[PDB]
Design a protein around this ligand. Structure first.
Ligand SMILES: *C(=O)[C@H]([C@@H](C)O)[C@H]1CC(SCCNC=N)=C(C(=O)O)N1
Length: 445
């Protein structure tokens, strides 16, 4: 009987480890149930009860990292009849990294399982989970220049220690009957990026030459369409301002400005620049994801969809992890940095996804979201720290999702991608994210 390997964080702190507990049994079942060898619960005894020192799989961060780490279980009859070397009372990973790394972690019952060290920072993981407070959402924090996944959070969550060691049918049905679905790994689920995506459309415009950062576009009204052929669809903005240049459009969230710049460049110039990103790519992460997509077809076949895609709507599906990877070009002078989860994995990059001038131009104008008093992220303003940010929402056809992207511009050591589902009921991502941004500005700097 070999010991299961440990999953540890970037500092060696435990994420999936082993711990000895003093657990059970070997009218009497009701007498045992009305007071607290087959273990039951962790510890003058009823008839049939006993205690023993059993080693159990333990997760220190608990629900804070449940979807990422996953849980283990007994080797089912269907599990052993699928591979080789399986004990009747063995332990196999059922989900998360406990499954994806199960081969390395279980060993052979005799060499012990190997220890896998991750990029996760436990302190960041716990902070990033604590801001949600049962709200449905996700948070992806990364080292933008190296790809390190410092945290991958999905909310709501579940207790991984009970699912692995002993959970009642009532607690499991409560987890399954949750409309928010705590078992899903929202950081790996594809969503529309929302207004935050305008950063990338802006960069693509700067490089294509059709978008001038100092050009003063005349925009009047709260809604705009190319002509009558658009029907009832309009590009809408929340505040009236004119004339609008690149910096003011990014601070005021002006879809009319970016719809016009997207129609100005055209589907070909827009797709030329989008294709340099990781659309369609399966990544090397041990997390299962559907590749990001631009639209359902190879061509928009619709000026409405072309403009809609310009500000993160339309048929865009990008997961939070893939969104973090795409947005890393602003902290690497246009170079994209793939995400890594294992700490000793080499950093993988994709050179010149956008130009260095376009990356820095966008990144500089995004300081206004935090530093200008009228900006939407002014609540997190800090005179001693350079932070660029960009809020955004995405309407799903009568619900909205809230997105917040922040970039460390003092040392380019962190990047955050936060999402709150059903933001009309659960609030924006900007309203809950300040403790996370403050925590990261002090730790990661
Ligand atoms: C993105 O650009 C969205 C649009 C695609 O729906 C707009 C709308 C929003 S917020 C308007 C409703 N909430 C008001 N408090 C913005 C944004 O700044 O998040 N961009």
């Amino acid at each position: 009987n070999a010991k299961r390997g440990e999953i540890v964080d970037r500092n060696g702190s435990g994420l999936a480890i082993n711990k000895v507990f003093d657990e059970g049994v070997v009218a009497n079942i009701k007498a045992f149930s009305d007071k607290f060898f087959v273990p039951i619960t962790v510890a003058e005894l009823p008839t049939g009860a006993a205690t023993k020192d059993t080693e159990s799989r333990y997760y220190p961060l608990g629900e804070a990292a449940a979807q990422l780490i996953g849980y283990t279980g007994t080797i089912t009859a269907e599990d052993i009849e699928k591979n080789p070397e399986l004990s009747s009372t063995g332990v196999i990973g059922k989900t998360g990294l406990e499954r994806a790394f199960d081969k390395e972690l279980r060993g052979q019952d005799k060499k012990d399982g190997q220890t896998i060290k991750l990029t996760i920072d436990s302190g960041v993981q716990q902070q990033a989970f604590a801001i949600f407070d049962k709200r449905p959402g996700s948070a992806v924090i990364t080292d933008p220049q190296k790809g390190d996944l410092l945290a991958t959070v999905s909310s709501p969550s579940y207790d991984p220690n009970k699912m692995a060691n002993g959970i009642s049918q009532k607690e499991y049905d409560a987890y399954n009957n949750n409309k928010d679905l705590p078992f899903t790994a929202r950081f790996a689920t594809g969503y529309a990026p929302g207004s935050t995506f305008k950063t990338i459309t802006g960069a693509i415009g700067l490089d294509a030459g059709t978008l001038k950062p100092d050009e003063e576009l005349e925009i009047n009204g709260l809604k705009w369409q190319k002509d009558k052929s658009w029907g009832g669809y309009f590009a809408t903005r929340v505040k009236e301002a004119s004339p609008v240049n690149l910096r003011t459009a990014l601070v005021n969230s002006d879809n009319i400005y970016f719809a016009q710049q997207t129609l100005r460049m055209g589907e070909d110039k827009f797709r030329a620049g989008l294709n340099k990103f990781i659309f369609g790519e399966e990544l090397d992460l041990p997390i299962a994801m559907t590749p990001a997509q631009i639209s359902n077809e190879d061509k928009f076949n619709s000026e409405i969809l072309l403009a809609d895609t310009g500000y993160g709507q339309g048929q865009l599906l990008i997961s939070p992890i893939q969104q973090a990877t795409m947005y890393s070009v602003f902290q690497n002078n246009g170079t994209l940095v793939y995400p890594k989860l294992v700490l000793d994995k080499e950093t993988k990059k994709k050179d010149n996804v956008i130009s260095a001038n376009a990356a820095n131009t966008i990144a500089t104008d995004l300081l206004g979201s935090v530093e200008d008093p009228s900006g939407y992220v002014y609540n997190m303003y800090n005179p001693n720290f350079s932070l660029a940010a960009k809020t955004g929402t995405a309407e799903i056809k009568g619900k909205e999702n809230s997105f917040l992207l922040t970039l460390d511009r003092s040392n380019n050591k962190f990047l955050t991608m936060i999402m709150v589902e059903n933001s009309g009921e659960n609030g924006s991502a900007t309203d809950i994210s300040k403790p996370l941004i403050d925590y990261l500005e002090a730790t990661i700097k």
